[PDB]
Ligand binder design. Structure first.
Ligand SMILES: Cn1nccc1C(=O)NCc1cccs1
Ligand SMILES: [Cl-]
Ligand SMILES: [Cl-]
Ligand SMILES: [Cl-]
Length: 163
């Protein structure tokens, strides 16, 4: 575990993370995809060998010894708000199980279902709160990666509020 488990947020490409493993915002088919997924495909393409997994699940594949946790959030274009909310919560719970299983002291994690799977809605708070619900019982340092300057501020505020 980390000596004093923390949450942090950085506004930069998660392919440049300084953590012991990464969470991919994957598609269910293990395709290269777009946004975070495409960045992860560029950096760790070996990790997409048999990475396909259903919605609401996480599947870890090594790139060398570097774990890539493929976490499949729901596409809110296809799910009802209710069912999507349940699958988004479930994907983060599976991430917390994988992070624990791997024994890492740190993890880089994007906000699932906030990009092209958001169904055109701002889901920062929904996705971040499900992240916290899952990760709070883990002792890994969690570093959340985002690209939007306003999101960085809001994620940072949400973290510092609970400290
Ligand atoms: C941190 N990062 N590295 C590369 C691209 C991004 C990013 O956060 N993009 C927006 C998305 C959030 C979830 C799916 S796409
Ligand atoms: Cl960058
Ligand atoms: Cl997304
Ligand atoms: Cl963002």
């Amino acid at each position: 575990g980390a000596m004093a488990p923390s949450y942090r947020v950085k506004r930069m490409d998660i392919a440049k993370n300084d953590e012991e493993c990464v969470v991919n915002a994957a598609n269910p088919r293990g395709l290269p995809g777009d946004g975070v997924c495409k960045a992860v495909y560029k950096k760790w393409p070996e990790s997409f060998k048999n990475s396909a997994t259903p919605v609401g699940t996480a599947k870890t594949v090594m790139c060398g010894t570097y774990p890539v946790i493929h976490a499949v959030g729901p596409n809110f274009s296809n799910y009802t708000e209710s069912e999507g909310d349940r699958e988004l919560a479930a994907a983060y719970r599976e991430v917390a199980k994988e992070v624990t299983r791997l024994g890492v002291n740190s993890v880089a994690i994007p906000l699932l279902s906030t990009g092209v799977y958001s169904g055109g809605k701002d889901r920062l708070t929904q996705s971040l709160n499900h992240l916290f619900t899952a990760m709070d019982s883990t002792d890994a340092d969690v570093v959340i990666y985002c690209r939007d300057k306003e999101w960085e501020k809001k994620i940072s505020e949400a973290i510092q509020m609970r400290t």
